[PDB]
Amino acid sequence: KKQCGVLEGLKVKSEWGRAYGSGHDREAFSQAIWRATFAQVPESRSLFKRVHGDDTSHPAFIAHADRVLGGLDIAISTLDQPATLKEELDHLQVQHEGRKIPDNYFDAFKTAILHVVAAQLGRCYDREAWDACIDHIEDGIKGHH
């Protein structure tokens, strides 16, 4: 849709700062996001069987979630500058390549993030912008192609 750009980056990078937050807000922010993801594609629960995907509230999974957002953080936070972002994305690219993950799931996970973020930021939040960037970040993980 939207391929992403310097300003739209700065915006998402900033807004993400507010939505991500810390402490419990985080432990929930992630929680909410995953619940929204799995609710969309229950099929995907099978992939996180290793980290108690059956019970979204299990510490193992809580860790996992909080751990995932972590990467997304680095992505968003890095992305402003192309030089570095490039690297992080590439790094991720590797941790993913080899492994089949349909583009169907990533789509849901994006939607999840977006809906939750919107719920968290109340009013100041540009949808298109996030969509565009979350996309660029995901592409960098799928290799898409």
Add this chain to the structure above:
Amino acid sequence: DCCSYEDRREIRHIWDDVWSSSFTDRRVAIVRAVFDDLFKHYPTSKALFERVKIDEPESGEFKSHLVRVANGLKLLINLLDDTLVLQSHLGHLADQHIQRKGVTKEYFRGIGEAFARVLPQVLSCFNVDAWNRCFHRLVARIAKDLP
């Protein structure tokens, strides 16, 4: 005419979003992006800044300049609550441009358009009108001697 107090408050806030951190990085890119729009529309003005080496965008001799401009604007806005002082520095700011041979009354109306096109892109919730209003009052007086 004189500017509404609410509008001033609006701007005194809108600005706090572009100025932002104490960092140069951000303010730089913005003020730059502003000038790039001034030059794309009034290319003549470009020449005026050879003194600061605009031919070397990342120079630093120039970057610093951009900052001074930014900060000079910052200083203005952050004075909107002290009228009397603003009214004076506002003059002093004119004199610093009248002695700069080649600066037209037009180039200013031009940089004004610049912000009004840039700012609404670097931050959301920008009251373009309110900005425009108080920015004009500021510009008018800055030119004002000059012509």
Add this chain to the structure above:
Amino acid sequence: DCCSYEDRREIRHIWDDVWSSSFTDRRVAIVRAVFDDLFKHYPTSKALFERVKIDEPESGEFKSHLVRVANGLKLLINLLDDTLVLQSHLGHLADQHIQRKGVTKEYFRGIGEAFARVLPQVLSCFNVDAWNRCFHRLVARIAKDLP
């Protein structure tokens, strides 16, 4: 006698109503009106102020005097919360009258009556008694010294 802290508070307020005008006009007319009552009753005292030219009511050499008297009273009242200092200046205020040949213990009891007759006319809600009480304590110590 002794007086009561509440009464002091009462006066510290009652005064703020007579004093209250900023500068001279008001306080003058009042302090004057006070003396006029002192002279109408103890005409003798009149002579004592030839030094300030009482024969020239609007003189200014005299008006200024009235003010000094007023302010001297003001200073007293505005000291009622700092006892120890009041107790000293109250003495100093006596000495300034003991060296003034011709000032009787009576004239004071007379000016006291004066206020008690004037004040109740320049402002409403005047606790004549409360005033009287604390004014006497002030006068006693002023007058007393001379003897």
Add this chain to the structure above:
Amino acid sequence: DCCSYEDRREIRHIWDDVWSSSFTDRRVAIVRAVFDDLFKHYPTSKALFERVKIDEPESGEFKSHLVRVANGLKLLINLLDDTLVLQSHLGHLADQHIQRKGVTKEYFRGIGEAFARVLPQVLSCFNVDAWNRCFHRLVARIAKDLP
């Protein structure tokens, strides 16, 4: 191990009960009572204080000493909230004992036991453990320098 913040708070209070009064009198008797327990257990150490005249308990040359010790402890505790400074003065406190020929690593572990036996008697609500914990951390760093 380490000291918890809560524990610090516990002590910052426990102390306010022993130190409290402005008076030497109290702190003296306590610090003394502490040493008397050090000497009854490690009699050897006694000799170390002939310089301050321990043979004259009520001397004053000695009482003052006790106080200095007390105050030195006070200074420590009252530093538990400023870590970095404590860490330095804690060293300086070591050096002042390393140059004191005859002071063993043992005598310290001994005075530690002392307080833990005295304090619980001079005041109620003494968290012997909490004290013990943070007192050891303090002693360890003091003593260690010496050997």
Add this chain to the structure above:
Amino acid sequence: RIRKAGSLRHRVEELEDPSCDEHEHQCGGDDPQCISKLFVCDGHNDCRNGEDEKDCTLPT
């Protein structure tokens, strides 16, 4: 009688430094519990109580 009394309850819920956050929603009730305003009405149940799902009617 219900609403009239419940209404009174509200007036009280308004007094005070609030159990839940501004953002957060107070489930109730016997035992308090704070969940996000975003957070109910997930469709998962927040509440033992089951507030996130019993308030039958959409105001809107």
Add this chain to the structure above:
Amino acid sequence: ECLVTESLKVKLQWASAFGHAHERVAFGLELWRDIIDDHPEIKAPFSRVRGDNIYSPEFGAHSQRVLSGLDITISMLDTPDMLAAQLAHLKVQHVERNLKPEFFDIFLKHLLHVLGDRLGTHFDFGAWHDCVDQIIDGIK
């Protein structure tokens, strides 16, 4: 002399700054302290009113008496006939005794410094300087 506004301005600001009751003693004290620390030569003539210990009641009294007079002069200013008279009256109480003229130039320096703190940036330095000055020369 001074401008009719330049007075009212001072008459007004003096009000807020000086204050009432204790608020004043505090002012007086703060003032004299700064003055004496700058020029300890003054503790000399203030020997009668324990100038060594400015916190003492003896000096405190004095402190107040002073400010009071200053109050008079200031509220005197606004109407010329009274001021001209009041000032003349003050000059006499001074001429007789010998003083060093520069002391007053000092007093003024601080009185302004202090009001500066009390009033803040609103403090109309100009008005005061032009106005209080006129009160000092008269006395000297």
Add this chain to the structure above:
Amino acid sequence: ECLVTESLKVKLQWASAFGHAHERVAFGLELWRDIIDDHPEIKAPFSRVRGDNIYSPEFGAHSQRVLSGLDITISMLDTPDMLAAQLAHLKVQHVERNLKPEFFDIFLKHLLHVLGDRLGTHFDFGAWHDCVDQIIDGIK
């Protein structure tokens, strides 16, 4: 030179101390007052900007303009290419004209004194001295 941390520290503390809007004018004023009382010789070059009455708008304006520049330099400071440039730019605005060397050493003395009050004990004197100094010499 300076250290990268020794800068960030100042860049950060400057933020809290300086402040925003009026809070600044207050700072500027307090600063210049202390400076001029210590060395009245300065009221001279500040003749153009009513240096006699620092509370005046004319001077107030100036005051601000100054602090602002100081803000720039400090904000420049961390990143060398901008600082080197900014400093060079300041040197020019000065060389042309007479100023005493020691005046700046004075300015610095107070700027630190003031930040000292504003920031308290946290104030990293070391970092500032090492850092603001570099800004003075260059312009100097």
Add this chain to the structure above:
Amino acid sequence: ECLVTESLKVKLQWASAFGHAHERVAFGLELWRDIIDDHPEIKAPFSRVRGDNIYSPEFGAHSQRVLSGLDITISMLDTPDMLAAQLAHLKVQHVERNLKPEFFDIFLKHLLHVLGDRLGTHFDFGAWHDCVDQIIDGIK
């Protein structure tokens, strides 16, 4: 020496002024800063305890140690046998090193200046001067 009341008064006021925990470090710092700015000659002997940077922990520690001793002396004084002893003990820690006699006269000047701020108008200057003085002489 002191009077009995003139002491209790100080013993008491010292309490409120000095304070507890951090409140103290703040006091100490404020004190030494004012002292060193007035007479930078002192930064010399304080070389061992980083006297150049009074905000440093090294100096901070020192600062505290000092005030503490002052606390002792002040507490001491009422009971003569302890004071006489304590004072004698302090004299020794000083006699050996060479020092400037006038330094203490300075220290005192400020200690009072500071307590003045802390305590306000209640501050019994008289009592302190008469009392802290006695503590300085013995030391010196």
Add this chain to the structure above:
Amino acid sequence: HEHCCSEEDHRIVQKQWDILWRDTESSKIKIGFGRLLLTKLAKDIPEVNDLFKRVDIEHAEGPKFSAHALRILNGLDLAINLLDDPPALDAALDHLAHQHEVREGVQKAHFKKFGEILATGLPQVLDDYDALAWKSCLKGILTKISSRL
């Protein structure tokens, strides 16, 4: 319980660690700081330079390393931000153990040192630092991370 890392303790650490990310340019900071932290490590123990060879540690400012600087420094973030959920934090760290286990050359003594370095560095960027609280928490973290051998 008492032994390990108290609620107040980390509540503190967390608060103090946040003083850092107040401005949007976290990247510039995290990098510079993490960069310095690793550098100062290779300084005191060179056998490290070979471990970080893979990430071009040779070029401190080189994106290759700058990225790394983040990953690590950012991992420390994760650790700190999960301090208030032991089970999660545990898992989160165990995972970090495994990511270091398969990296031969990395020995315990390395962490011990990195810890000392980190403890001397933090107080240089944070005006409000509580050495006691931090040391307590950093220990628990560093240990659990290197636990896997």
Add this chain to the structure above:
Amino acid sequence: HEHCCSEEDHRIVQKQWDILWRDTESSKIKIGFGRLLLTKLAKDIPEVNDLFKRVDIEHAEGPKFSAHALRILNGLDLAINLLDDPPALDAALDHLAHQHEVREGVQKAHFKKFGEILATGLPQVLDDYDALAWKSCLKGILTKISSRL
């Protein structure tokens, strides 16, 4: 224009104009102030002296004029105090227009000047003055008063 003399604008003016009437001797002030204001007008434009001839402007301190000084200055008060009720203020001012219409000699340029004078005077008696707000409101007032010639 439309924007200006907003609610906040005049709310300000009103507040600041009140700093004046804190003391009971309003008369002495209003007079002195209004006296000066008119004087300084006749100073810059003499053809005025003839207009105020009727009120013995020749004798500034003369009761004849002192009274006038009030009436005018007091009218300005009315204007300001009705700023928060446009319809009323409107009517109140229109009335002032008519009272000036039948006074030949009085031309617009007079008000323009009086405005400039008033704007330079107020800030001399009021420590807290917001030039922007005032100019905005004074304009609306002065205009509506003269707008009928």
